[PDB]
Amino acid sequence: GEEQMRLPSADVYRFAEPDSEENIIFEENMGIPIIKAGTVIKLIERLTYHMYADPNFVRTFLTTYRSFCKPQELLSLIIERFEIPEPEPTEADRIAIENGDQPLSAELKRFRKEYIQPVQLRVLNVCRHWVEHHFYDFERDAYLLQRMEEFIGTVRGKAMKKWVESITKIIQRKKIARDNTFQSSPPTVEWHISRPGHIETFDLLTLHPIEIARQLTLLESDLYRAVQPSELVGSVWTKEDKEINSPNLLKMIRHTTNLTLWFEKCIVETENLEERVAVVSRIIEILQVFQELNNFNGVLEVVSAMNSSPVYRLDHTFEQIPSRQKKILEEAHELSEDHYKKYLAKLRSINPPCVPFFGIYLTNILKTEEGNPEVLKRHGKELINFSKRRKVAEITGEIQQYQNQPYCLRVESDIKRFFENLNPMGNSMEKEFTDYLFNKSLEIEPRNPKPLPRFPKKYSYPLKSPGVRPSN
């Protein structure tokens, strides 16, 4: 047809081949069509489509492309997309040109205005979005940035120079940011037995339970806000380049692991029954203050430690926990039942700030990664399943909704360092450390036929909690 013949030939340009069932497919539409799957060449063509802007596809593609295309490869493909060949002059214009006259160039001017200029501006819009929302690709790869800067720095014409200046302004702002707010005063920092600065005495029962929950919420809020969506795409936190591709996500997971295991260690290593009741009761009070602060991540870290194999079996310890605290713990656990039905209602109704439970996002993303194929086959050809990536991107979009909710709480540097440097395992691996905790659990409360032994006290300081009500 006429529309296809005016486009460049396949022997001079790869992004102009006709659409077909074996190179691009779409979801049901009733409006910009939604791409279900396509080859990388068709995804690049639609990423920089001449007929209309597509901000949803650009956003989803730049968040998830690392699962099917390398950053260097994507830059080469969008640069290749930008370099469009122009049609040859018509016979009449060829005669005008050889006589030294100005050609009419009717179709040539139309191709430049309706195809070349829109595609080139779309390529530049992709570059701008890439540097604005995913500058980490350029921080990790200095050669990728040198290539980008050379490309934008050699684009000609005043119409595109304004776009180039906007891209450069972002790149420079990002480089400057690598180098170098409250309405009310935050509440008073709470202290119990440990005095400010006496970091040697810092522990679960010597620090104030209110301040443990506040500082852990500040720590977890910062860790939550730092996770970038691409760190969660294609299960990259479970593959070889995990440390480079998912640094903030792995830091969130390791804090959750270390805090949960630290709570369990505090419990099972407290061999005296009465002292262990005080330890468990103090962790429940920490959960209460996490609930007050809408730190659902912290509430469910306490629930995980209490449900763990070594702690959950301590019938004699929970027997002495007051009914009110046991009820608080049971309702916190019921937040997780029925696929987190009650947690989702609580999260939707609460007033910010909050720290959402991060584990549910990992669970849902892994379900989507394992449950959907990487590619779709149509007529014996493989197409990248883009709808799978879009489903993951929508879960990461929910994460981003709660990443702009700072707390009006004062940081206590020593308490912050104490929780950032938790190392319950020491030199042990996780599996061997959990086997240790379970054997310690069997020692302090042996299985039913065997009687319950007495153990000596380990804490010199008083065990009475100062409560969860502030002081002033």
**353 preceded by a cis bond (ω within 30 of 0):** yes
Contact residue for ligand S2Z among 27, 107, 139, 330 (CB under 6 A) = 330
- Binding status of residue 326 toward ligand S2Z by CB under 6 A: yes
Question: Smaller CB distance to ligand S2Z: residue 304 or 385?
Answer: 304
Residues 36-65 interacting with ligand S2Z (rule: CB under 6 A) = none
CB of 330 to ligand S2Z, least distance (A): 4
When computed from its CA atoms, the radius of gyration of the chain, rounded to whole angstroms, is 30
CB of 229 to ligand S2Z, least distance (A): 31
Which residue number is nearest to ligand S2Z in terms of Cβ?
Answer: 333
Contact residue for ligand S2Z among 86, 101, 165, 334 (CB under 6 A) = 334
- Binding status of residue 342 toward ligand S2Z by CB under 6 A: no
- Alpha carbons 469 and 317: distance in angstroms, whole number: 25
CA separation, residue 418 to residues 189, 330, 394, 414, 424 (Å): 16, 29, 35, 6, 12
- Closest to 396 in 3D by CA, of 63, 107, 129: 63
- Binding status of residue 307 toward ligand S2Z by CB under 6 A: yes
CB of 286 to ligand S2Z, least distance (A): 13
Q: Which stretch binds ligand S2Z (CB under 6 A): 132-140, 224-232, 327-335, 434-442?
A: 327-335
CB of 254 to ligand S2Z, least distance (A): 23
Q: How many residues bind ligand S2Z (CB under 6 A)?
A: 10
Contact residue for ligand S2Z among 43, 212, 223, 306 (CB under 6 A) = 306
Contact residue for ligand S2Z among 283, 303, 354, 360 (CB under 6 A) = 303
Question: Smaller CB distance to ligand S2Z: residue 152 or 329?
Answer: 329
280 CB contacts (<8 Å, ≥6 apart)?
A: 267, 306, 311, 314, 317, 318, 321
Contact residue for ligand S2Z among 13, 136, 318, 436 (CB under 6 A) = 318
Contact residue for ligand S2Z among 329, 347, 399, 444 (CB under 6 A) = 329
Contact 171, 136 (CB under 8 A): no
Contact residue for ligand S2Z among 33, 107, 312, 471 (CB under 6 A) = 312
CB of 323 to ligand S2Z, least distance (A): 10
Q: Which stretch binds ligand S2Z (CB under 6 A): 25-33, 233-241, 302-310, 402-410?
A: 302-310
Q: Which stretch binds ligand S2Z (CB under 6 A): 144-152, 170-178, 325-333, 411-419?
A: 325-333
Question: Smaller CB distance to ligand S2Z: residue 333 or 346?
Answer: 333
Q: Which token pair is 161?
A: 């120079």
Question: Smaller CB distance to ligand S2Z: residue 39 or 307?
Answer: 307
Question: Smaller CB distance to ligand S2Z: residue 223 or 311?
Answer: 311
Q: Which stretch binds ligand S2Z (CB under 6 A): 12-20, 131-139, 242-250, 305-313?
A: 305-313
**26 alpha carbon, distance to own chain's centre:** 27
Q: Which token pair is 31?
A: 């409006």
Contact residues: ligand S2Z, CB under 6 A: 303, 306-307, 312, 318, 326, 329-330, 333-334
